[PDB]
Scaffold this motif. Sequence first.
Motif, PDB file in Angstrom:
ATOM      1  N   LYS A  45      49.261 -26.141  27.795  1.00  0.00           N
ATOM      2  CA  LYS A  45      49.211 -25.408  26.539  1.00  0.00           C
ATOM      3  C   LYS A  45      48.087 -25.984  25.676  1.00  0.00           C
ATOM      4  O   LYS A  45      47.693 -27.131  25.871  1.00  0.00           O
ATOM      5  CB  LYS A  45      50.553 -25.497  25.798  1.00  0.00           C
ATOM      6  CG  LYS A  45      51.693 -26.121  26.591  1.00  0.00           C
ATOM      7  CD  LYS A  45      52.966 -26.240  25.750  1.00  0.00           C
ATOM      8  CE  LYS A  45      52.700 -26.927  24.414  1.00  0.00           C
ATOM      9  NZ  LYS A  45      53.944 -27.092  23.606  1.00  0.00           N
ATOM     10  N   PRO A  46      47.560 -25.187  24.729  1.00  0.00           N
ATOM     11  CA  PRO A  46      46.499 -25.604  23.800  1.00  0.00           C
ATOM     12  C   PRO A  46      46.789 -26.960  23.166  1.00  0.00           C
ATOM     13  O   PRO A  46      45.869 -27.719  22.856  1.00  0.00           O
ATOM     14  CB  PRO A  46      46.544 -24.519  22.728  1.00  0.00           C
ATOM     15  CG  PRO A  46      47.003 -23.310  23.459  1.00  0.00           C
ATOM     16  CD  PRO A  46      47.864 -23.752  24.599  1.00  0.00           C
TER      17      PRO A  46
ATOM     18  N   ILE B 272      52.220 -28.081  31.367  1.00  0.00           N
ATOM     19  CA  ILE B 272      53.366 -27.293  31.799  1.00  0.00           C
ATOM     20  C   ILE B 272      53.923 -27.791  33.124  1.00  0.00           C
ATOM     21  O   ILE B 272      53.170 -28.087  34.052  1.00  0.00           O
ATOM     22  CB  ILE B 272      52.982 -25.813  31.936  1.00  0.00           C
ATOM     23  CG1 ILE B 272      52.134 -25.388  30.738  1.00  0.00           C
ATOM     24  CG2 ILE B 272      54.227 -24.951  32.061  1.00  0.00           C
ATOM     25  CD1 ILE B 272      51.585 -23.994  30.845  1.00  0.00           C
TER      26      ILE B 272
ATOM     27  N   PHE C 222      48.439 -14.936  32.722  1.00  0.00           N
ATOM     28  CA  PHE C 222      48.435 -15.159  31.279  1.00  0.00           C
ATOM     29  C   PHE C 222      48.161 -16.623  30.969  1.00  0.00           C
ATOM     30  O   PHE C 222      47.405 -16.947  30.053  1.00  0.00           O
ATOM     31  CB  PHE C 222      49.775 -14.757  30.660  1.00  0.00           C
ATOM     32  CG  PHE C 222      49.712 -14.524  29.175  1.00  0.00           C
ATOM     33  CD1 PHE C 222      49.590 -15.583  28.289  1.00  0.00           C
ATOM     34  CD2 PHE C 222      49.777 -13.240  28.663  1.00  0.00           C
ATOM     35  CE1 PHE C 222      49.526 -15.365  26.924  1.00  0.00           C
ATOM     36  CE2 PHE C 222      49.720 -13.015  27.300  1.00  0.00           C
ATOM     37  CZ  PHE C 222      49.594 -14.080  26.429  1.00  0.00           C
ATOM     38  N   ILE C 223      48.785 -17.506  31.739  1.00  0.00           N
ATOM     39  CA  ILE C 223      48.636 -18.937  31.532  1.00  0.00           C
ATOM     40  C   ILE C 223      47.234 -19.392  31.928  1.00  0.00           C
ATOM     41  O   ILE C 223      46.683 -20.316  31.332  1.00  0.00           O
ATOM     42  CB  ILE C 223      49.694 -19.742  32.314  1.00  0.00           C
ATOM     43  CG1 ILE C 223      51.102 -19.270  31.958  1.00  0.00           C
ATOM     44  CG2 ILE C 223      49.583 -21.211  31.991  1.00  0.00           C
ATOM     45  CD1 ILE C 223      52.192 -19.939  32.769  1.00  0.00           C
TER      46      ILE C 223
ATOM     47  N   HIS D  12      44.235 -18.787  28.993  1.00  0.00           N
ATOM     48  CA  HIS D  12      43.932 -19.802  27.990  1.00  0.00           C
ATOM     49  C   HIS D  12      42.911 -20.805  28.505  1.00  0.00           C
ATOM     50  O   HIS D  12      41.975 -21.175  27.796  1.00  0.00           O
ATOM     51  CB  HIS D  12      45.196 -20.543  27.566  1.00  0.00           C
ATOM     52  CG  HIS D  12      44.925 -21.833  26.863  1.00  0.00           C
ATOM     53  ND1 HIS D  12      44.187 -21.904  25.697  1.00  0.00           N
ATOM     54  CD2 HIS D  12      45.273 -23.106  27.160  1.00  0.00           C
ATOM     55  CE1 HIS D  12      44.101 -23.161  25.309  1.00  0.00           C
ATOM     56  NE2 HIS D  12      44.754 -23.913  26.179  1.00  0.00           N
TER      57      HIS D  12
ATOM     58  N   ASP E 218      53.227 -20.549  11.845  1.00  0.00           N
ATOM     59  CA  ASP E 218      51.850 -20.705  12.340  1.00  0.00           C
ATOM     60  C   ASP E 218      51.005 -19.409  12.155  1.00  0.00           C
ATOM     61  O   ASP E 218      51.526 -18.325  12.430  1.00  0.00           O
ATOM     62  CB  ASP E 218      51.844 -21.184  13.805  1.00  0.00           C
ATOM     63  CG  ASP E 218      52.468 -20.180  14.764  1.00  0.00           C
ATOM     64  OD1 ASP E 218      53.428 -19.487  14.371  1.00  0.00           O
ATOM     65  OD2 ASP E 218      51.995 -20.090  15.917  1.00  0.00           O
TER      66      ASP E 218
ATOM     67  N   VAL F  63      44.301 -17.581  22.814  1.00  0.00           N
ATOM     68  CA  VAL F  63      45.320 -16.600  23.158  1.00  0.00           C
ATOM     69  C   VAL F  63      46.729 -17.126  22.900  1.00  0.00           C
ATOM     70  O   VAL F  63      47.130 -18.160  23.429  1.00  0.00           O
ATOM     71  CB  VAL F  63      45.190 -16.144  24.624  1.00  0.00           C
ATOM     72  CG1 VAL F  63      44.971 -17.343  25.533  1.00  0.00           C
ATOM     73  CG2 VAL F  63      46.413 -15.343  25.043  1.00  0.00           C
ATOM     74  N   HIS F  64      47.472 -16.400  22.072  1.00  0.00           N
ATOM     75  CA  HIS F  64      48.827 -16.786  21.693  1.00  0.00           C
ATOM     76  C   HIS F  64      49.834 -16.183  22.667  1.00  0.00           C
ATOM     77  O   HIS F  64      49.541 -15.179  23.312  1.00  0.00           O
ATOM     78  CB  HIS F  64      49.109 -16.304  20.269  1.00  0.00           C
ATOM     79  CG  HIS F  64      50.143 -17.110  19.545  1.00  0.00           C
ATOM     80  ND1 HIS F  64      51.461 -16.727  19.465  1.00  0.00           N
ATOM     81  CD2 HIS F  64      50.044 -18.272  18.859  1.00  0.00           C
ATOM     82  CE1 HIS F  64      52.136 -17.620  18.762  1.00  0.00           C
ATOM     83  NE2 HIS F  64      51.299 -18.568  18.383  1.00  0.00           N
ATOM     84  N   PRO F  65      51.019 -16.805  22.800  1.00  0.00           N
ATOM     85  CA  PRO F  65      52.087 -16.179  23.586  1.00  0.00           C
ATOM     86  C   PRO F  65      52.499 -14.831  23.010  1.00  0.00           C
ATOM     87  O   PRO F  65      52.975 -13.966  23.747  1.00  0.00           O
ATOM     88  CB  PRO F  65      53.242 -17.170  23.447  1.00  0.00           C
ATOM     89  CG  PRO F  65      52.574 -18.479  23.271  1.00  0.00           C
ATOM     90  CD  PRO F  65      51.349 -18.196  22.445  1.00  0.00           C
TER      91      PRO F  65
ATOM     92  N   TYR G 241      51.153 -11.189  24.181  1.00  0.00           N
ATOM     93  CA  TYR G 241      51.729 -10.474  25.314  1.00  0.00           C
ATOM     94  C   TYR G 241      52.094  -9.034  24.948  1.00  0.00           C
ATOM     95  O   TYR G 241      52.809  -8.788  23.977  1.00  0.00           O
ATOM     96  CB  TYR G 241      52.970 -11.220  25.819  1.00  0.00           C
ATOM     97  CG  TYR G 241      53.435 -10.823  27.203  1.00  0.00           C
ATOM     98  CD1 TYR G 241      53.966  -9.563  27.447  1.00  0.00           C
ATOM     99  CD2 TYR G 241      53.361 -11.718  28.263  1.00  0.00           C
ATOM    100  CE1 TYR G 241      54.397  -9.199  28.704  1.00  0.00           C
ATOM    101  CE2 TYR G 241      53.793 -11.364  29.529  1.00  0.00           C
ATOM    102  CZ  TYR G 241      54.310 -10.100  29.743  1.00  0.00           C
ATOM    103  OH  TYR G 241      54.746  -9.731  30.995  1.00  0.00           O
TER     104      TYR G 241
ATOM    105  N   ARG H  19      60.740 -14.897  30.237  1.00  0.00           N
ATOM    106  CA  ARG H  19      60.209 -15.606  29.086  1.00  0.00           C
ATOM    107  C   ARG H  19      61.032 -15.309  27.837  1.00  0.00           C
ATOM    108  O   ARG H  19      61.218 -14.150  27.458  1.00  0.00           O
ATOM    109  CB  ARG H  19      58.739 -15.245  28.877  1.00  0.00           C
ATOM    110  CG  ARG H  19      58.421 -13.796  29.135  1.00  0.00           C
ATOM    111  CD  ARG H  19      56.971 -13.507  28.822  1.00  0.00           C
ATOM    112  NE  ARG H  19      56.845 -12.591  27.697  1.00  0.00           N
ATOM    113  CZ  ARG H  19      56.991 -11.275  27.799  1.00  0.00           C
ATOM    114  NH1 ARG H  19      57.274 -10.729  28.974  1.00  0.00           N
ATOM    115  NH2 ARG H  19      56.861 -10.508  26.727  1.00  0.00           N
TER     116      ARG H  19
ATOM    117  N   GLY I 155      58.400 -18.136  23.405  1.00  0.00           N
ATOM    118  CA  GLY I 155      57.082 -18.741  23.471  1.00  0.00           C
ATOM    119  C   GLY I 155      56.682 -19.266  24.837  1.00  0.00           C
ATOM    120  O   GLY I 155      55.527 -19.631  25.045  1.00  0.00           O
ATOM    121  N   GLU I 156      57.627 -19.301  25.774  1.00  0.00           N
ATOM    122  CA  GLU I 156      57.390 -19.911  27.080  1.00  0.00           C
ATOM    123  C   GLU I 156      58.098 -19.131  28.177  1.00  0.00           C
ATOM    124  O   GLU I 156      58.801 -18.162  27.901  1.00  0.00           O
ATOM    125  CB  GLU I 156      57.862 -21.375  27.111  1.00  0.00           C
ATOM    126  CG  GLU I 156      57.701 -22.149  25.803  1.00  0.00           C
ATOM    127  CD  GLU I 156      57.341 -23.609  26.011  1.00  0.00           C
ATOM    128  OE1 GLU I 156      56.132 -23.913  26.099  1.00  0.00           O
ATOM    129  OE2 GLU I 156      58.260 -24.452  26.074  1.00  0.00           O
ATOM    130  N   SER I 157      57.925 -19.574  29.419  1.00  0.00           N
ATOM    131  CA  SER I 157      58.510 -18.890  30.566  1.00  0.00           C
ATOM    132  C   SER I 157      59.131 -19.867  31.560  1.00  0.00           C
ATOM    133  O   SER I 157      58.606 -20.956  31.790  1.00  0.00           O
ATOM    134  CB  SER I 157      57.459 -18.031  31.273  1.00  0.00           C
ATOM    135  OG  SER I 157      56.643 -18.824  32.118  1.00  0.00           O
TER     136      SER I 157
END
Lengths: 69, 502, 103, 1340
Positions: free
Chosen positions: B447-448, B453, B471-472, B475, D442, D548-550, D553, D635, D638-640
């Motif tokens: 993650k940023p 992960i 998607f992952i 980034h 945020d 890129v933010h979650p 999506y 997901r 914010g995560e998966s």
Amino acid sequence: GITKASLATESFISAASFQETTRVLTEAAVAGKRDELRGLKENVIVGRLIPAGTGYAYHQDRMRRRAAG
Amino acid sequence: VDALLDNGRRGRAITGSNKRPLKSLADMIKGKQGRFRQNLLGKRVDYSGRSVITVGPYLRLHQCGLPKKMALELFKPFIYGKLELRGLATTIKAAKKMVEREEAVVWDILDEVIREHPVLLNRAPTLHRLGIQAFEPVLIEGKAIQLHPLVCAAYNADFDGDQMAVHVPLTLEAQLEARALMMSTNNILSPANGEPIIVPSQDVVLGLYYMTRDCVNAKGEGMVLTGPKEAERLYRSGLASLHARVKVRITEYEKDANGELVAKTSLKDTTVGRAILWMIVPKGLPYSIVNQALGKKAISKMLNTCYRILGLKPTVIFADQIMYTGFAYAARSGASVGIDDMVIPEKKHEIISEAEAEVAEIQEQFQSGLVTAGERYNKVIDIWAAANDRVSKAMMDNLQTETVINRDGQEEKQVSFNSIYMMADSGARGSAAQIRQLAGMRGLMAKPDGSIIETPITANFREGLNVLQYFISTHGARKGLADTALKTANSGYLTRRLVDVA
Amino acid sequence: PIGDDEDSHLGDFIEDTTLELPLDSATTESLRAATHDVLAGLTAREAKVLRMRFGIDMNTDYTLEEVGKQFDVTRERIRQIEAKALRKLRHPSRSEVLRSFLD
Amino acid sequence: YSYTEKKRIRKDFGKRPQVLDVPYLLSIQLDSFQKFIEQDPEGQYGLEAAFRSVFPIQSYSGNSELQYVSYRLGEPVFDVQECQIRGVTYSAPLRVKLRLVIYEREAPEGTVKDIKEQEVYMGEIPLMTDNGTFVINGTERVIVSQLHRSPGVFFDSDKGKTHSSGKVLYNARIIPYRGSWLDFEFDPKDNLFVRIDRRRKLPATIILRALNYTTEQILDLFFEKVIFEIRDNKLQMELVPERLRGETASFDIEANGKVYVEKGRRITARHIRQLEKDDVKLIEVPVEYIAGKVVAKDYIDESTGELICAANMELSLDLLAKLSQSGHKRIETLFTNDLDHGPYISETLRVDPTNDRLSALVEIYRMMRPGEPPTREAAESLFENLFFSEDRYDLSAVGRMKFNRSLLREEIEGSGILSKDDIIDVMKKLIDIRNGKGEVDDIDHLGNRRIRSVGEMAENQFRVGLVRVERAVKERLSLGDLDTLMPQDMINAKPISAAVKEFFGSSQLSQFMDQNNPLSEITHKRRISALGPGGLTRERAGFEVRDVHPTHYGRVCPIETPEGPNIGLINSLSVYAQTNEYGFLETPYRKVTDGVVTDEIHYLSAIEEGNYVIAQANSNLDEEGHFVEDLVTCRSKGESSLFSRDQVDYMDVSTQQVVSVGASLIPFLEHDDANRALMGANMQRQAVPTLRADKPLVGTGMERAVAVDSGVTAVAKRGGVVQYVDASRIVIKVNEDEMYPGEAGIDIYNLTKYTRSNQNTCINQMPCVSLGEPVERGDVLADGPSTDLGELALGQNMRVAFMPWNGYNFEDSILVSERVVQEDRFTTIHIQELACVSRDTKLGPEEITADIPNVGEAALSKLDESGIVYIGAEVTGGDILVGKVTPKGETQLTPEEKLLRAIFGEKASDVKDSSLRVPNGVSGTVIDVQVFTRDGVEKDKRALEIEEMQLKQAKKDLSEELQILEAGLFSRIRAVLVAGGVEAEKLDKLPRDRWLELGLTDEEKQNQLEQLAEQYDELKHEFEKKLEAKRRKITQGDDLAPGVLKIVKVYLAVKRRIQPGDKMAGRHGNKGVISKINPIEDMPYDENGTPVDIVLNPLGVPSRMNIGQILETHLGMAAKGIGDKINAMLKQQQEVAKLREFIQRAYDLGADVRQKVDLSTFSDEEVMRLAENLRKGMPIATPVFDGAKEAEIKELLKLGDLPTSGQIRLYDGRTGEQFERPVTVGYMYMLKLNHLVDDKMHARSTGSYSLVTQQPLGGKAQFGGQRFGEMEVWALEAYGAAYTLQEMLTVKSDDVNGRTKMYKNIVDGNHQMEPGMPESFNVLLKEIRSLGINIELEDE
Ligand SMILES: Fc1ccc(-c2n[nH]cc2-c2ccc(NCCN3CCNCC3)c(C(F)(F)F)c2)cc1
Ligand SMILES: [Mg+2]
């Protein structure tokens, strides 16, 4: 430091290039500073031969003529 | 008065009817774009041009393809003078009328004024002095500039639509400066370090690599030949294979006498390809240099030694021939890439499964409370990392050595002739990491924040990536482009401070 | 300021139209050589009369009466000589060099 | 299934069924503007709302009020096409009713006179096309949707970097839609501070005083109360048992005859429970414990009336005694804890310079407008006008919503201005955050990110116009006489008109539609920007906002964003994405109730989606659709991760919804690295249309949607049969069920023919239907540029082989066969618009006349008598399109020239040649010419020829309209008469014009006949008025700029095929520049002897990891295989059975795919056409992440007769000998981007020069030279080349003397330079000397 050491340059024309111009011109003008060129940047600005490379034969021959007979 | 001299140190007066503050004499002197005084940011220049660039492998390293029309317009004043010097045009006006009409006779005159007259070629991100290099113009039908391949490394010039700018050296002193200093052949070595910048790039090294290499059993295995000539003759006639273990007689030289080249002959154990290639290597170099597998590094050190022994000219023409033969033989080789060229380990899924068992082990321990959350985190991350290492070092063995081939017996195994491997191994293109991303699983992302992960991408590019995985990956991509594009700027700023201090 | 927000500003694009192009300047330099050689062609007196009737290599230019008082052979006379002078440079041997100038 | 699908069907791999199909891709653009200009009978956004905001405008107390009634938009002056030809804007006049009322002086309010000025005109507002585009000057334009921080309140951190002591800091920010910003922030001393906008920092409490809160009420607001009693004597205290948490005993804690805690023992949960159950209300404390306690309210001596202690002061042992003897029983103190409830506000007061409301207001007014003397009315007015005025402040609806929601309130809607309660609650939440309860939001979260669109922004700019008109109205109503002036004389036009015109004409968000391409258009129209007004700058905001933010999506496409200076500051809109009701972004989802996946769609915003656990687009469910595994990748927040079988609330609608339309067009995308995918979708928009729209052989299944949704094609309005098909137009006869009763009908489609696109490419429509063909409603009637049979073809597929060929492919370089350049497939048609301007100079007017000084008969040949080039004449560089001559008298020649003139007797003209000529090197054909004339100036010969021509063509067209229409109507009357009174042969005998007299038996059919009568006549007169209007529009002089008498625009169509230096690329981010064009002779070929079109470089594939381009090749090959087979079977002419069999077999392909198939289709006429289209190759669809698998591809290769390897034997066309090893050959879809080299190429010898500083400058579009910069100079410095440098910066450029003295030497054959001094430095010398500075040049 490299950014600090760059501040000091004999030629004011050179300094007026990469530094803050407004300050350099004033600060030089009060001292009555006389720029002899002699460097690369200054001769690049004023538009004559670089005192290096091919021009090193010129500027040298002129350098010795200066401060002399 | 203040506003006139330097505006903005009091009120910043505004110009009539327009909100934007008016430019004062101080602002006239200062300029903009940080500190730039018009000798700094840049200055427009006559006798120049530019366009999209192409390959031109036919070129010697001392020349470049220059579009016809471009040459006409660039050399227009010379052409005017050369036209009326020979008396083909009454006056300068008539000369203009002629070149504007593009009459048949002017092209020859252009070939006259072009001959010994160099031109300066430059690319967009000029960093080191090699960013500008002088070439001998070669008239070409087209709108594209042709630039010698071996120079592509110096310019950092891809062929993806980068452009190059041309500048015509005008005065005699400029021509001779360009020829004796900025000339391509006169810089073969990076000023940063004595190593050659003219080192063969990609296709060529895949060519020389494919050339000198050896498989276990091939046409003409074990036989013997008089010299490189009948070796090449053996190859081109389809009788002997490019790579086969063979003894051939060679004549090498050693300058190790005093300024003098000694001769010595012998039967060397080498291959057909190495024998053929040897024809190119000039004079005093020992046969030892071409008798290896010829990777990018070795193919570079060949050039380096040649230069530190024979001098400049032989090294120049040597590099030229190396390029030509590399391209030709790489072309003959029929190297390609299919979907089946990328081999996934058969044991991959099993590694995945076991390493996936470890995570449920430590998960069970966290459920039972034998281990703390963070310690758990480190544990799982470690088992997955170990997993990736295992899959990588599986696919690397399988990809590298798996050729299993028979000479007169049942079985023997050597380094693979698979395309993608040859490409990665030679140093042409690709690398263990990227190949690892192709066949083996790719990495563990972060993650940023930089918290890595704990569920790595199990799938690779040869397989599909699903939604989440992609998607992952995104980034990582965007941050990659951002960071690189940023480090370009930081580089520039740094060099700037450097030349300022020096 | 015009587009890109860059240092491109309106005044940067204003081109000097009052400058003469070098392409023409060369021809202005050549025309002098041509007309000089061609003026070496005519008789020394016809040459003087033609160089006088026009400002060729001289201050201003001269009225035909003036040319007459200078030459001591005056009036209609000059106007005749001039004509024939033009006539000598009219049909090509002489004319092939000058005719190339008119575009 | 549809009718053009019977023509061609794309074979679709992939499993996942589509529960929802792709919506209208242009939805956002049209909806926004639909909201802007519209009549909404309430405050919802629109011209109505923006009107109701500023209005009614009343004078200052003068009781002269101007109120707004209602508005309207007049019909457009010129329609879209006409507005495009002429170059005016496509807009509507805005006519608004204003009522001017005057109140009788010294009322009860009643009006002397109210004059209702009927619809005063203010401004002309632009209109959006059906395609979501605006035409500003003769040019289609798009307004990019904006992405900004939503209005409301926001809580941030700024931990780390500030102060490097850690400790973080905590800040709140109130950002309204309009009005000043309100900021709260802490500091390292935990003193709360407030700042309005970015301005000076003030202690927080200073604002509270301005809301009229004394210190006592501030304390009473932010802290709880600790009660102290002096009962009997010496110090009891009230105790809430929870207060002792997180604290240690300062003394013996005892009450109720029982000692609960002893000194030195920290009070834990045990002690607290003991106190709670034993219920100790009051305990005895020492007099020394209040030494640190802070008194709440003010305390005075009841007797002496003097202040014992001020509010918020630290008590002491003596002060206690001093207030105790005065008879005070109770003392209120603050409840203060350095862990739980913090003592912030108190210290904030300790730093507060003020005392009373007026004082605070003084400090505020002197903060906002410093240095000028503060006044009471001034401070009051300013402060009341900042956040509290309906005029100067609004958060609006989104603002108030997000505000109240983030404050954990109930009301979702409220006032547009802040209240004391609001500000206070915000401060409370911030203090709570510092206290440890609550978290900071945020900025990157898409719930805090809001999308605007064309409508909203246009509304805002018009709002500015309305306020600047408000100032004027109030200014005029000041001194006004009563019944003379009306709501005209005050309200202007130019301010409003320019308020909108400035917006649409030049704005960073308003730009020229990128139309080189149907993908480019539609992908431009869906776009977001965080830049421009209300947004950040590239220089300002760093990596976070770009990253890129979650939450991106399903809303924002991760992989499509620009690669340049602004990355992630643009992005794009996702496929299935939508603008939320409040203006946020929401994405489709499938509701999972109990254990089933329901097919009901659900739209969740960024915040809505947060807590729910959402399943995956790719997951295995079957039958009733229950999850097949016991845990599935999902997901939640914010995560998966892996989630339990029944936990998940929802599931992704499709596999595509993560990406955008650009990314959804990349086949085998899952196999490509994200960088190269990015580059790919970035370049796919740059593809110039080809001469023959081909089709992608390797597809996705989105291209159909892009083709149709984008307006480049021509789509049937209503289903029917085709009456007529021309390259010009298409006439369809409507079916009755879809047909309206009146005006009968036929749908006539006028196709766009060859015309100039924005990018100077050609845009031309071609008919895809034939005479008398069935057409379903919503079917493609005609193909646009780069669209084939209703799909999107951005380029052409071709045979490609991966193998090094003689280093001609060296880096990315492309080596292409002559077969391609000969087939003219990659050829492109460019359409350029050139102009000639006839101006007015003080020396005289300029003539367009064909009489031009110094041109041969060959030059004046291509021009008519009037001086304009004939339509259709093919031209090249140097050809004169329009003859133009401008007066310049008295050349003032020189002596030798005078001699020359004397000999050659030439009259030097008083006229100079300005004629517009074709730019050097470009060549093409003239497809049109226009002449704009100042109204009143006499039209020349050509312009009149053209005008008459256009008049005749107009009459012909209109007459065609009326004729096909009338026949269409009478054909219906004929049919209705035949029911109830049928006479077959009898009716068609007598003249048709006399049909309307004949009636029918009593029935509704008579009323239908009536209907057709009415509408018939309507059409009949409408024709008349339309012809009249057309004629007037043709003849009228178009309004022109100052000084320009007339303008002639010539339209050229250039055909450029392909040449080395051009850019070409696949969809996979693989670029290239064509190196050589190689003969078919030298081309690599297979055993079948079929050469390969393009030879790529394999070395490009491994490094940049895009493996898709290989898959795409393989499948591509396979596709062509299916074609070739069919191509033989048709050329064998077998029969319907064999072909049908093979095609079915192809469309089935092993097992488990969703495609279905035929023999519901007609066995002969329909099938043979399908195969007929398929013979080029079999179009395949590869859904984004649902796409085809290797085994499927190999399996299709088996059906093809071609190897599994995808590689075959190839032979060098030169030596004829075989290439060692197999090489990959296949079909790769390829695009020609327009970087084309005859654009990029430039050269200059001696050109024009800049006036201010003499430097090379192109004035003719004869280019200025290259820019030699600092780095290039350094590069020259490293080499020893001084002279190259000197000539570079002196003679070749900056030296006004040097350049000419040079040129002469260059032509003289002498290479030298006599440099002189550069003009830059020369000017700088003056600029320095222009000041008080003397700069001189010394010595010798
Ligand atoms: F759609 C998906 C798919 C996979 C993941 C995912 N799965 N496992 C971990 C991640 C992951 C975690 C964090 C980030 N970025 C930072 C967001 N944090 C929350 C508050 N704002 C700042 C920090 C990302 C991503 F997408 F940004 F790269 C992915 C997430 C979303
Ligand atoms: Mg590049």
